[PDB]
Design a protein around this ligand. Structure first.
Ligand SMILES: [Ca+2]
Ligand SMILES: [Ca+2]
Ligand SMILES: [Cl-]
Lengths: 163, 303
């Protein structure tokens, strides 16, 4: 059981966009999440992975392949601080009792794709990181089941340094 | 067989108590006269007055029945003599001969304070024939245990989400339980317990309304009160669903939207609203929202 951030490319020139994909693996009865992601904003700029449009405080990352049935009322929230190199976003079904009744949990999939535009070819790290607003998180990640309870006991797989 | 009984009463210091003096086995011939003396403890009781009982049929009862209270002597003298002169006001039935009205004194010792027939002359019928009579002493049980008229309606309530000991007292306390159409209510304590005392008997049934800021109102109908009534236990409490934040008796998107306005606020920060911190862990975040979601789309009827 895990949540992972992984990059499609680990090398690039100023102006390239590295695509960081946030993925969950074998997360039982998964119904929602919140994650906190930090990067160095002098080296990388969070952007839309397809358009290069820069993230603001309210930008929710595109590209998830889970929690996509509008029947269960997905609600997405973003509260980034790009100036300070912070992404913080969350999404969950609201009608979890209806999702549960269906009995098919979406336990693996993509939850976000995030582009990071290279501002400097300087060695740099992007990582899930704990933050004051998420007490009890697992390295800045909180995953929730269709009972509305916190899920525990999964690995947080951080990406290697971007050299 | 003719019996004179001092009754019993129960009071707290400061209470006014009534101690009946009963006659049983009154002869067919009736009782025309009687005299006796009661002793009491004037440390415990201040005699206020002795009311002639229902058995005293003289239209001017004082003409047939009088008492003399002597606190310094610790004695009450009872004298009865049917005043009509023809037997007309003779006692002819069993019942209350007199009522001792007494105030239990403000700092009186507790315990049973005996009221005893300490001297007995005779009861005599209309023909002046003495009737052989049994004496039974009584008194007042002075304790400090409160007595409430009416009944106790009580129970346990529990919010439906996960929390630990650091916050259990906060989330369990503060549910108001109201008896609808009365001014009677209780508020749950830190254990989720409530009790409303002095509830009038009602076998037709009360409706209870359980309410708290951010919770979906719960209505419990047909609560029959023929005695002390427990509506739930600590092991099987009345569950309450949080998430009615914009109060419309429905958990919907406007409720979630209100939590989002404080998203990621932490205790002590500008945008922190304690009520929106559902689980009271000091942060407003997706975990709180997911608790709201537990009962999404629910209305009070769904309980
Ligand atoms: Ca509402
Ligand atoms: Ca919280
Ligand atoms: Cl229940």
């Amino acid at each position: 059981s895990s949540i992972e951030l992984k990059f499609d490319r680990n090398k690039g020139e100023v102006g390239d966009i590295l695509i960081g994909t946030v993925r969950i693996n074998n997360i039982k009865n998964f119904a929602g999440f919140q994650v906190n992601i930090v990067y160095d904003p002098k080296v990388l700029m969070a952007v839309d992975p397809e358009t290069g449009k820069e993230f603001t405080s309210s930008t929710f990352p595109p590209g998830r392949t889970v929690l996509k049935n509008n029947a269960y009322g997905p609600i997405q929230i973003a509260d980034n601080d790009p100036e300070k190199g912070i992404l913080n976003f969350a999404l969950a079904y609201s009608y979890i009792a209806g999702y549960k009744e269906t009995g098919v949990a979406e336990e693996s999939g993509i939850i976000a794709k995030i582009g990071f535009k290279i501002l400097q070819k300087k060695s740099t790290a992007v990582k899930f990181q704990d933050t004051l607003s998420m007490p009890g998180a697992i390295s800045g990640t909180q995953l929730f089941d269709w009972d509305g309870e916190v899920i525990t006991g999964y690995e947080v797989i951080q990406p290697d340094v971007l050299s | 067989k003719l019996t004179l009984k001092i009754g019993r009463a129960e009071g707290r210091p400061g209470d006014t108590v009534e101690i009946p003096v009963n006659l049983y086995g009154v002869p067919q011939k009736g009782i025309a006269s009687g005299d006796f003396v009661v002793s009491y403890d004037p440390n415990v009781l201040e005699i206020i007055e002795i009311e002639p009982g229902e058995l005293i049929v003289d239209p001017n009862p004082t003409k047939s029945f009088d008492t003399a209270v002597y606190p310094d002597r610790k004695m009450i003298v009872f004298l009865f003599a049917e005043d009509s002169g023809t037997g007309a006001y003779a006692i002819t039935e069993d019942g209350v001969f007199a009522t001792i009205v007494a105030k239990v004194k403000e700092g009186a010792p507790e315990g049973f304070s005996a009221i005893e027939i300490s001297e007995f002359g005779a009861f005599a019928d209309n023909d002046l024939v003495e009737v052989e009579t049994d004496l039974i002493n009584g008194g007042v049980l002075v304790t400090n245990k409160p007595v409430i008229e009416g009944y106790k309606v009580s129970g346990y309530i529990l919010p439906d989400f996960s929390f630990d000991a650091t916050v259990a007292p906060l989330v369990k306390a503060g549910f108001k339980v109201e008896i609808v159409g009365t001014e009677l209510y209780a508020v749950t304590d830190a254990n989720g317990y409530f009790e409303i005392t002095g509830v009038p008997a009602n076998a037709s049934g009360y409706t209870l309304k359980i309410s708290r800021a951010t919770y979906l109102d719960r209505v419990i109908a047909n609560v029959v009160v023929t005695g002390d009534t427990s509506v739930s236990t600590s092991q099987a409490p009345i569950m309450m669903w949080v998430g009615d934040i914009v109060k419309d008796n429905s958990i919907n998107l406007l409720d979630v939207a209100e939590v989002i306005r404080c998203f990621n606020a932490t205790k002590g920060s500008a945008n922190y609203v304690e009520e929106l911190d559902i689980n009271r862990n000091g942060a407003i975040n997706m975990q709180d929202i997911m608790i709201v979601h537990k009962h999404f789309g629910a209305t009070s009827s769904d309980y």
